[PDB]
Amino acid sequence: EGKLVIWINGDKGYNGLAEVGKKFEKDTGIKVTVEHPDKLEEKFPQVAATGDGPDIIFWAHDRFGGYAQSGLLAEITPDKAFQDKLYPFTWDAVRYNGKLIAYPIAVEALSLIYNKDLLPNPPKTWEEIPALDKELKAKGKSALMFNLQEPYFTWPLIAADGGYAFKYENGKYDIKDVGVDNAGAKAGLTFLVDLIKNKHMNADTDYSIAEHAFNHGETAMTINGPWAWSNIDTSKVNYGVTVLPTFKGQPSKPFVGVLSAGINAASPNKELAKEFLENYLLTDEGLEAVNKDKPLGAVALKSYEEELAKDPRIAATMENAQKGEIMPNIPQMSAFWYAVRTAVINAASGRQTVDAALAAAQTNAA
Ligand SMILES: OC[C@H]1O[C@H](O[C@H]2[C@H](O)[C@@H](O)[C@@H](O)O[C@@H]2CO)[C@H](O)[C@@H](O)[C@@H]1O
Numbered sequence: 001e002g003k004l005v006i007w008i009n010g011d012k013g014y015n016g017l018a019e020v021g022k023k024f025e026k027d028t029g030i031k032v033t034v035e036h037p038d039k040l041e042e043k044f045p046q047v048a049a050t051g052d053g054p055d056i057i058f059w060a061h062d063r064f065g066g067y068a069q070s071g072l073l074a075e076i077t078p079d080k081a082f083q084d085k086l087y088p089f090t091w092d093a094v095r096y097n098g099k100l101i102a103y104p105i106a107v108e109a110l111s112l113i114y115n116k117d118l119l120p121n122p123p124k125t126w127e128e129i130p131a132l133d134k135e136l137k138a139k140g141k142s143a144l145m146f147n148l149q150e151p152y153f154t155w156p157l158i159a160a161d162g163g164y165a166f167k168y169e170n171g172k173y174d175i176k177d178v179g180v181d182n183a184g185a186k187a188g189l190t191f192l193v194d195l196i197k198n199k200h201m202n203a204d205t206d207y208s209i210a211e212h213a214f215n216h217g218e219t220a221m222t223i224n225g226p227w228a229w230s231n232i233d234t235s236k237v238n239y240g241v242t243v244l245p246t247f248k249g250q251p252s253k254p255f256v257g258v259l260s261a262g263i264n265a266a267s268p269n270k271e272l273a274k275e276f277l278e279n280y281l282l283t284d285e286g287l288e289a290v291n292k293d294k295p296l297g298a299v300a301l302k303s304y305e306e307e308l309a310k311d312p313r314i315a316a317t318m319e320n321a322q323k324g325e326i327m328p329n330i331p332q333m334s335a336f337w338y339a340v341r342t343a344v345i346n347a348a349s350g351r352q353t354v355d356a357a358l359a360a361a362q363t364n365a366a
Pocket residue numbers: 009011041060061062063108150151152153225257337
């Protein structure tokens with residue numbers, strides 16, 4: 001009471017967000033503490049269930065349906081004037097059972113990021129990457145490194161030739177129809193595993209390692225979102241942001257997230273949380289503060305987004321988004337993500353075959 005605690009992931013602009021919080025404190029006397037706990041998306045539903053946790057939680061919209069189903073989120077009530085300020089499709093991402101359960105902030109999609117000095121013309125296909133890696137390994141470089149620990153990053157390849165999460169049918173997802181074990185999913189994961197077994201990639205590679213390699217010019221390419229650009233800017237690597245490579249002639253299909261801010265149902269500061277989000281954060285100046293720390297991607301706020309749209313990196317982001325699909329927000333997404341995380345880790349490390357890993361994933365996801 002009389003305080004705001006906010007959780008946002010450590011890869012986002014939490015210092016920029018904190019600057020908005022300082023402005024809020026200056027105006028209102030309400031202190032705002034921004035934190036970035038590890039695994040906050042799993043931590044929230046645990047501590048919020050007891051009525052603890054943050055006043056406001058930031059995460060991609062996919063997790064919010066489950067939070068809402070658990071009664072963990074307060075229903076938000078922006079009026080017409082405010083809703084008209086954000087793109088309709090962003091409001092769509094934070095609707096659950098007819099109710100708005102969060103404020104949309106920004107649209108995120110993975111792109112191919114490449115080093116222009118090592119790779120003036122980036123590959124259009126996944127298939128050519130092994131040969132490119134061999135050429136680079138002769139120079140002590142690698143072609144591509146990206147986070148293999150989180151299925152968010154491998155999904156675009158798995159989905160390329162036909163993998164999918166849950167079948168969409170006329171407004172509803174059929175949670176009994178999962179596409180993680182079909183021929184398309186298997187072809188994509190098999191290709192990934194082949195890269196690893198043949199030493200073009202390392203099963204070990206995680207977010208920090210991939211980011212390190214790209215930003216020090218050790219690898220020619222990486223796969224990451226808008227938040228990553230800030231650190232590359234500092235590294236002085238000459239980079240481009242472009243369309244993900246195709247697989248079997250088909251576009252890579254990233255799962256698109258809408259970074260959203262939910263209010264804890266157990267919060268005694270719901271009115272203040274709304275005031276902060278609507279009138280401090282979701283303004284030209286508020287989003288700019290966060291964006292300048294770590295880029296948000298394409299923001300939900302029309303007035304600022306139409307300025308950001310001039311950025312070819314954002315154009316690239318949305319080109320990839322359009323080839324991909326907006327994540328469902330249904331409660332079953334958590335089971336889906338866990339199933340696929342396990343499958344990719346087990347296949348990549350050789351603990352299971354691709355067929356065995358994905359068969360288990362099909363069961364676990366549904
Ligand atoms: O890997 C599964 C994971 O994917 C998504 O998480 C993304 C997040 O959306 C992005 O904002 C970014 O920060 O990277 C995360 C992956 O490390 C889903 O949103 C999440 O629920 C899911 O577990």
